[PDB]
Amino acid sequence: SIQAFVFCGKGSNLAPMQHSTRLPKALLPIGNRPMIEYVLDWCDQADFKEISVVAPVDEIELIESGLTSFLNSNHSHHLQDPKKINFISTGESLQKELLPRINGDFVILPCDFVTDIPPQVLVDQFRNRDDNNLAMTIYYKNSLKQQQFFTVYSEILLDVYSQRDVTKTKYLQIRSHLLWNYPNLTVSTKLLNSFIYFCSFELCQLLKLGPQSMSRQASFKDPFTGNQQQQNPPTTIFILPNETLFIRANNLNAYMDANRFVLKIKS
């Protein structure tokens, strides 16, 4: 019924540290501490027994060694390496592969995480409201250009538009069928997704029938809109993702945000 997922990979976007075969992205000393310590702490706080960790074709034992040595958890961890991933798809292809192991609801948490917010209250929220998908947003630095688009609705807290500004069309693009329903919408410019994901049981069947998932963000949560015509049959509450805002400093790392985390730490 209850299970947690840990996603692991290898760096490609960052400039420097990762080129060596011996040292991966999973075991990095930012400030005399491993990067995955925080995740472990979070998991401990949450209290869960069955946790399955996914890993690519590269590094098969190093991660295990890291898990073993130094480190508190005292839980049973299981690590697997499927040989189908080619980096060019990250975790969607893993998800598609592993399905009979899933019993109930599952929590998705990647390796790249810095956390300070209360842990259990997200889970509790997910449990209470009874929805398919949940994601979180945190503001960019205020202390001394186009980034990415988000929309918020509040009276229940729901997500409407989450498409990024990579291959951005010069004018604003929405839909009026998604606008006439929910007449009030607030445009967010500063907020950024911090890779926090919660998912339910009614998603396992759709993956085998129709594969459409991309980058775990582009089309993982984006197929939800039941507007205009509707042709695809739903599996048996309307298919809608949720979004909640937070004040405290907890952020992601992907682009040019690695030296700032150190600064944040040392004060």
Partner: protein
């Protein structure tokens, strides 16, 4: 282990006997608890819909779910730590929101069931029969009884009616709905609302969802509402061994008003709600909650205004206390609709010895 101590607001001078404190946001617990119980507790603590009738049903459902999920350990028998688990659950429930009479009855039934089948039978055969039996029981003593009550009410209602109603009692909602739909009479529904829980509002909403002519009033506005209006209906929680109406908040006053203005009151109850516990006042044992319910300044539940009040601990000598469960007078209600069609409230424990 759980959580102990730390209580918000003043403890007050009068009415100090029952728990009013506790876990609202969870922090550090025993790593063996099934989460469904916890979730239920969380719900009950911050509930605005439930009122005596559905809670017990929900509890039963939860128990059934637990049974379905239950797996017998390889070493110890089916009942060894199960009882301990049950006790823990009970403790959690009490910490969250005190146990009702119906809940107690359910617990007793469960205990009886446990005693009935001794540890000797295999896993998949025993629980298959247990869950079915429990379902059958539920079908019998609850839903069917409710249906019977409804049918009794149907014949009891005459021509040309003007009714004043109160509460989030499911049976009453069912009754009113039935009147609206299948009877097609000249029914008028007037609703009374209360401060601790928005039950009246919910009732009104339900009525609207059917399409009924609705007047909406409060506890204060009663002197002008009568000035044609006849029937008064209330929702009961439990009847004691004395015969007194041990129910929710704003009922007794309404009953008194009805008595004053000629026409008597009718109350509905189930044939399992009866108790052996003896009490004649609200001081004995009462559902007391945190003063957070009496903070919002009218209109709606989620508004949050920075008006005049917003402090409890910092204020020197200030007691802001409210009560949820009340004890109404015996002689004021005349009609009681139970499993045995019709009867007086002075019967008290005629069904208790009957079992």
């Amino acid at each position: 282990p759980g959580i102990s101590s730390v209580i918000p607001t003043v403890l007050e001078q009068s009415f100090d006997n029952s728990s009013l404190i506790s876990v609202k946001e969870l922090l550090l617990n025993k790593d063996l608890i099934h989460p469904s119980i916890l979730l239920l507790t969380s719900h009950l603590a911050h509930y605005k819909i439930v009122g005596s009738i559905p809670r017990c049903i929900a509890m039963l459902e939860v128990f059934q779910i637990v049974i379905k999920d239950y797996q017998t350990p390889k070493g110890t028998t089916l009942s060894r730590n199960l009882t301990s688990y049950l006790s823990h659950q009970i403790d959690l429930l009490k910490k969250a929101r005190p146990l009702s009479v119906t809940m107690g009855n359910a617990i007793r039934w469960l205990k009886q069931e446990i005693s009935l089948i001794d540890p000797s039978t295999p896993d998949k055969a025993a629980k298959k029969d247990l869950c079915e039996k429990i379902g059958q029981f539920a079908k019998e003593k609850i839903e069917l009884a409710d249906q019977l009550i409804i049918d009794n009410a149907s014949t009891q209602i005459e021509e040309s009616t003007t009714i004043v109603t109160y509460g989030s009692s499911k049976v009453l909602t069912e009754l009113l709905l039935h009147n609206a739909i299948s009877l097609k009479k000249n029914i008028k529904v007037i609703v009374v609302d209360s401060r601790p829980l928005f039950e009246g509002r919910k009732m009104a909403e339900t009525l609207r969802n059917a399409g009924v002519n609705v007047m909406y009033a409060l506890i204060t506005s009663l002197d002008t509402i009568f000035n044609d209006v006849d029937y008064v209906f209330l929702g009961a929680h439990s009847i004691l061994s004395n015969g007194f109406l041990y129910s929710r908040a704003g009922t007794a006053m309404l009953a008194m008003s009805a008595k004053r203005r000629n026409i008597p009151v009718l109350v509905c109850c189930e044939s399992l709600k009866f108790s052996q516990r003896v009490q004649l006042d609200s001081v004995t044992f009462n559902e007391l909650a945190d003063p957070n319910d009496l903070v919002n300044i009218d209109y709606e539940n989620p508004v949050e205004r920075r008006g005049n009040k917003g402090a409890l601990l910092n204020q020197f000598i200030k007691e802001r206390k409210f009560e949820k469960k009340k004890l109404a007078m015996e002689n004021k209600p005349k009609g009681n609709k139970i499993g045995g069609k019709k009867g007086s409230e002075g019967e008290s424990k005629d069904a208790s010895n009957e079992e």
